[PDB]
Design a protein around this ligand. Structure first.
Ligand SMILES: [C][C]1[C]C([C])=C2[C]([C][C][C][C]C3=[C]N([C][C]4[C]([O])[C]([O])[C]([O])[C]5O[C]45)N=N3)C3=C([C])[C]=C([C])N3[B](F)(F)N12
Ligand SMILES: *[C@@H]1O[C@H](CO)[C@@H](O[C@@H]2O[C@H](CO)[C@@H](O)[C@H](O)[C@H]2NC(C)=O)[C@H](O)[C@H]1NC(C)=O
Ligand SMILES: *[C@@H]1O[C@H](CO)[C@@H](O[C@@H]2O[C@H](CO)[C@@H](O)[C@H](O)[C@H]2NC(C)=O)[C@H](O)[C@H]1NC(C)=O
Ligand SMILES: *[C@@H]1[C@H](O)[C@@H](O)[C@H](O)[C@@H](CO)[C@H]1NC(=O)CCCC
Ligand SMILES: *[C@@H]1[C@H](O)[C@@H](O)[C@H](O)[C@@H](CO)[C@H]1NC(=O)CCCC
Ligand SMILES: *[C@@H]1O[C@H](CO)[C@@H](O)[C@H](O)[C@H]1NC(C)=O
Ligand SMILES: *[C@@H]1O[C@H](CO)[C@@H](O)[C@H](O)[C@H]1NC(C)=O
Lengths: 497, 497
């Protein structure tokens, strides 16, 4: 292993400094002997996913908090964890020297990093781009004869995706989402602002737009990349808003329902890409459960929809139970998947806060809340940004788990990187959430899952200043006696046989 | 009566221009015989609370939407409507020549204007102040011997409140709310940031803070002003947030519960001000019903709490039914009151948009939703701001129904002014919300109330671009045939006998 090189920028915790010749890394994965548990610990005080091991005790006495595993209480199976290969992310990564590029990609995708198995790929330009382009900017090209991938795909995004997949030992799933259509398909004739597809579902505008999805998948397939899933549109509610500042395409839930039923569903189903999954919504969870009811109560739409994609924006969240919980209850066979998460700032906070433990705790709290309300996966936004939180053509700067300083050939791994890692590294695809009950009221956030091989994983987050003595009971093996320190996150792993 | 002098600033509608010698005004109220209705109309196209009359007829000629009054279905009684006399509002008003000041105060408080009967008064400084002060900044003065009102109170706020009350045809209710305590009572020793009262409820810090409320009410009573109500703290959740940029004081719901039970309740009850009502929360409705459950399930706190004050800023995240509706169901004898609203505070909102019809529709849509979910009153924020949305010492610039241009001795009455007026002018204190049944699904927002004298008032908001043919039925009078134009608000009034 190689430890964190810590640096303070004057906030609550440190970043880990990486360059062309040095980055913090794990030893290859090891399983703890039966009768023992593994612990990975990160702290505000500066510990970064440090490994320790302890015994599983046969007996326990005391008045202390007990968390009891309920392994027969089975919930959702996990698809995975990752982030977005935006134009901004790819530009920042490829501005580093080649050896630094490889250490950044290994940090995310290697078993000696945090084992990401999802990459979200924008279909052409978004706000995290340095220009507005689509794949078909020739006006009224209904046959899409002038459809092509620009350099942002062929020189930045595609080569980094190939390199990520080569570094990963876990199979990686690609997810594609469009922000805007060509402007000649839109009522307002602009990439941004209030505007939807022209005409009505079933018509030439809607069929052309569905064919654009197939052309995108064809072009990526020519580059030997296959997609797990596409979303119907990034944030369809955005294109309903007057003055929306960047790339968008407005759909009401009724418009999305009818576009899926008449155009996108049939076009994908009749293509060579029929095995690609379709996710609906791809938007703020405040729109649930109404959006799900409108789309999935229509059997002609529902038969094409594999899942519901939700967004997380720290500053503006609807309650999980009324949104995620009620949607699962109405549509239990339609998976919920978190397709975009990032920390934006208030008028009083900077876009990037180097070493913010608070922003780390917000990611991990969010991930736990999502896993407790049926969500099968979690996708960060930009894989990397510069210290301004860019580039971004509308200056919609936000934070990222990895901040690249091109002038120093350096990148900084934020607390958010490690908070995400406590899940992504230790919860492989096919893991199933199981029950975990507290003996008493407590300030901790915790979630338990079982790996495909039947082994246990528990993540415990302490967002309080106080150390909390804790016992985890697993009826199969016994008691894990531990302490959750104030401002810490732990992952516990143990064999059950 | 004097009509609106319209001026466009390139937004969706016009402002009404007022100066030292001219402001748009109403004639005294004059209401017609049984069988006649009054209609006040405002439109994006530029009509401003224009009066027309027509017949309520025995025969029904409409074949569209019917709204039927159900006067036997009775809900909440109304406390009233108004806005906040902040330092910023008082500075802006007093920058006008005295004749212009009088036309502005008459616009809000006179029967020649929109009949405000509520003024919210900050207890010392907030963001809408040009400096940081409290009433007791001399440290370790636990008996508050050095408590005093500065010129902001004695020169600006108090004289303007006297003049408002002189001009009002209705009794005006004053509501007080503190942002911060003296910093020597706080854990962080700062006017802002993450910080609460030192120590624990019942101790010297908490007793001093409760005594500060009595000292404030004593000081205003010496100036012959008496309060209807106080809130336990403005936005108590703000003082729980690291780096909160302006005046705040953090309380968890448990801290608010124990402060009310041990200190504020008993201190107010043992004073000459025992008749002043105490409102809890004074914060976003997303905190309901949880905050209400924590405070009101403790009888020692609940016996001092008259009501729950709500702010509008996270309404889009929190459906009324899940927050206001559920709180009413759990605590049906504890009134809900809307104590703060404004547009221009979100990062996607330009601070001031002179003539914004959208911002007008936001006010009226909020007031209707509130009234349909048991809310008894609705209080705007700053009564007046400058064209930048200030002054504000942290540059938290926002919009206001009246914008003062002091360099031209001019003020502008925004669509928000008229949207608020469609309620404030025509729903006096003690009005009762009654049933209004829609015959079919429609795009209108509507609410019916009955005046203390038994006469009817119905407000109809059309946020759609399409004219809606409408019939209103009063079982005791007959059928009102009308049209709700696209982007209009109407108030209908009629005698029932
Ligand atoms: C750069 C930043 C980043 C960003 C996301 C924005 C935006 C977009 C802000 C969206 C605000 C918002 C409001 N809502 C709730 C709202 C909901 O109440 C509706 O019923 C739904 O149909 C729809 O979901 C929308 N969701 N998001 C923006 C608008 C709309 C205008 C401006 C100027 N900007 B901006 F400031 F430029 N800007
Ligand atoms: C890249 O980072 C590494 C680790 O911080 C730097 O290596 C350290 O350099 C200092 C000063 O030369 C030595 O005292 C340390 O012993 C080195 N540590 C290790 C573990 O090798 C390296 O210098 C950095 N590269 C650049 C170009 O700045
Ligand atoms: C205050 O506003 C009023 C109304 O807009 C202005 O009055 C107008 O003045 C012009 C000449 O300057 C007259 O021809 C109009 O007939 C006036 N209208 C009315 C209804 O009287 C007035 O000038 C403004 N005051 C200042 C100083 O500009
Ligand atoms: C998600 C958007 O799709 C992406 O384009 C933005 O860069 C990012 C930050 O603004 C995300 N936005 C949101 O989640 C919405 C913000 C709340 C209004
Ligand atoms: C209400 C506050 O009490 C007042 O001080 C602010 O000026 C006003 C506008 O910012 C309101 N607060 C907020 O908007 C808080 C942010 C919403 C969660
Ligand atoms: C479309 O593509 C064809 C074939 O490459 C090319 O000849 C034509 O000029 C293009 N038209 C444009 C870019 O307008
Ligand atoms: C506070 O008031 C007392 C009299 O009650 C006075 O003696 C003292 O000097 C005052 N302190 C300040 C700083 O004004």
């Amino acid at each position: 292993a190689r430890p964190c090189i810590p640096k303070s920028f004057g906030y609550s915790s440190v970043v880990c400094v990486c360059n062309a010749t040095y980055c913090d890394s794990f030893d290859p994965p090891t399983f703890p002997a039966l009768g023992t548990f593994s612990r990975y610990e990160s702290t505000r005080s500066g510990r970064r996913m440090e490994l320790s091991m302890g015994p599983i005790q046969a007996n326990h006495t005391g008045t202390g908090l007990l968390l009891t595993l309920q392994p027969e209480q089975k919930f959702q199976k996990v698809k995975g964890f990752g982030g977005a290969m935006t134009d901004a992310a790819a530009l920042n990564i490829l501005a580093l020297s080649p050896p630094a590029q490889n250490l950044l990609l290994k940090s995310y995708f290697s078993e000696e990093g945090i084992g990401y198995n999802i990459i979200r790929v924008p279909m052409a330009s978004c706000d995290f781009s340095i220009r507005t382009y689509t794949y078909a900017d020739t006006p009224d090209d209904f046959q899409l004869h002038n459809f092509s991938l620009p350099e942002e795909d062929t020189k930045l995004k595609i080569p980094l995706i190939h390199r990520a997949l080569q570094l990963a030992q876990r199979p990686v799933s690609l997810l594609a989402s469009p922000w805007t259509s060509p402007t000649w398909l839109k009522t307002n004739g602009a990439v941004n602002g209030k505007g939807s597809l022209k005409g009505q579902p079933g018509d030439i505008y809607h069929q052309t737009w569905a064919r654009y999805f197939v052309k995108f998948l064809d072009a990526y397939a020519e580059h030997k990349l296959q997609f797990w899933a596409v979303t119907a549109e990034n944030e369809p509610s955005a294109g309903l808003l007057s003055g929306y500042p960047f790339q968008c395409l407005g759909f009401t839930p009724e418009h999305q329902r009818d576009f899926i039923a008449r155009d996108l569903g049939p076009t994908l189903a009749n293509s060579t890409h029929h095995n690609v999954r379709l996710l609906m919504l791809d938007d703020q969870r405040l729109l649930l459960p109404h959006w799900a009811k409108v789309v999935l109560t229509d059997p002609e739409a529902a038969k094409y929809v594999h899942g519901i994609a939700v967004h997380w924006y720290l500053d503006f969240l609807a309650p999980a139970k009324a949104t995620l919980g009620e949607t699962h209850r109405l549509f239990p066979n339609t998976m919920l998947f978190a397709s975009e998460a990032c920390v934006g700032s208030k008028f009083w906070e900077q876009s990037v806060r180097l070493g913010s433990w608070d922003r780390g705790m917000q990611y991990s709290h969010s991930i736990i809340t999502n896993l407790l309300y049926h969500v099968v996966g979690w996708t960060d936004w930009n894989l990397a940004l510069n210290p301004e939180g860019g580039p971004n053509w509308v200056r919609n700067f936000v934070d990222s788990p990895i901040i690249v300083d091109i002038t120093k050939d350096t990148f900084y791994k934020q607390p958010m990187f490690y908070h995400l890692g406590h899940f992504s590294k230790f919860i492989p695809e096919g893991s199933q959430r199981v029950g975990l009950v507290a003996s008493q009221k407590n300030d901790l956030d915790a979630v338990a899952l079982m790996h495909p091989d039947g082994s246990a994983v528990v993540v415990v987050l302490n967002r309080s200043s106080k150390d909390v003595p804790l016992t985890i009971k697993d009826p199969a093996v016994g008691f894990l006696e531990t302490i959750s320190p104030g401002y810490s996150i732990h992952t516990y792993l143990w064999h059950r046989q």
